[PDB]
């Protein structure tokens, strides 16, 4: 008398879908509040050309982050992104990033960076950067 598999939840058997549905499905179990922040991050963590992810993508990603020889490498530039961020205070402004990312070795990114943001921030936060290379 128990269950734990998005399989049914989905049923569609399409494998992929809008985690949003899984975010709520789970949110109505152990958690309660987070489906938002998550769903959000996820939605952005996707943008692979739709917005519908697959339990696999999530799981794989988890097993991908689990590995102790990949993230760390980035963690470094990350910890630096947060530290170096003395003016940003959390978000790195074009100039900031451009210079930072460039000082780090992402001059060719400056292009995607400037073309990355353009909604209502004009800057790039830790995530953002990590988003470009997630
Ligand atoms: Ca996808
Ligand atoms: Ca932005």
What's domain 69-134's architecture? Orthogonal Bundle (1.10)
Query: What separation in Å is there between the alpha carbon of 118 and the centre of ligand 2?
Result: 6
> In this structure, how many other beta carbons lie within 10 angstroms of the beta carbon of residue 49?
6
Query: What separation in Å is there between the alpha carbon of 53 and the centre of ligand 1?
Result: 4
b vs e for 61-92, b when ≥16 Cβ sit within 10 Å of the residue's Cβ?
Answer: eeeeeeeeeeeeeeeebbeebeebbeebeebb
Which ligand has an atom closest to residue 48 CA?
A: 1
Residues of the chain with CATH 1.10.238.10: 1-68, 69-134
Experimental method: NMR
Let me know: does 78 contact 126? Beta carbons within 8 Å: yes
Question: Beta partners for 16?
Answer: 54
Which ligand has an atom closest to residue 90 CA?
A: 2
Nearest Cα to 114, choosing from 12, 103, 102?
102
Query: What separation in Å is there between the alpha carbon of 47 and the centre of ligand 2?
Result: 14
Query: What separation in Å is there between the alpha carbon of 129 and the centre of ligand 2?
Result: 10
Rounded Cα distance, 131 and 29, in Å:
29
* Residues present in the chain in total: 134
Query: What separation in Å is there between the alpha carbon of 11 and the centre of ligand 2?
Result: 36
Rounded Cα distance, 34 and 31, in Å:
7
Query: Could you list which residues have their CB under 5 Å from ion ligand 1?
Result: 46, 48, 53
Nearest Cα to 78, choosing from 65, 59, 61?
65
Element (H, E) at 17: strand 16-17
Let me know: does 97 contact 113? Beta carbons within 8 Å: yes
3-state secondary structure (DSSP) of residue 134 = coil
Let me know: does 58 contact 21? Beta carbons within 8 Å: no
Nearest Cα to 129, choosing from 120, 114, 119?
114
Please tell me the class of the 1-68 domain.
mainly alpha
């Amino acid at each position: 008398m128990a269950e734990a598999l998005f399989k049914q939840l989905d049923a569609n058997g399409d494998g992929s879908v809008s985690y949003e549905e899984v975010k709520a499905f789970v949110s109505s179990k152990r958690p309660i509040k987070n489906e938002q922040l998550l769903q959000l991050i996820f939605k952005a963590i996707d943008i692979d050309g739709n917005g519908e992810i697959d339990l696999a993508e999530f799981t794989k990603f988890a097993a991908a982050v689990k590995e102790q020889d990949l993230s760390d490498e980035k963690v470094g530039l990350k910890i630096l992104y947060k530290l170096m961020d003395a003016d940003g205070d959390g978000k790195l402004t074009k100039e900031e990033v451009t210079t930072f990312f460039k000082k780090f070795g992402y001059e060719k990114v400056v292009d995607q960076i400037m073309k990355a943001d353009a909604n209502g921030d004009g800057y790039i936060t830790l995530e953002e950067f990590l988003a470009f290379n997630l």
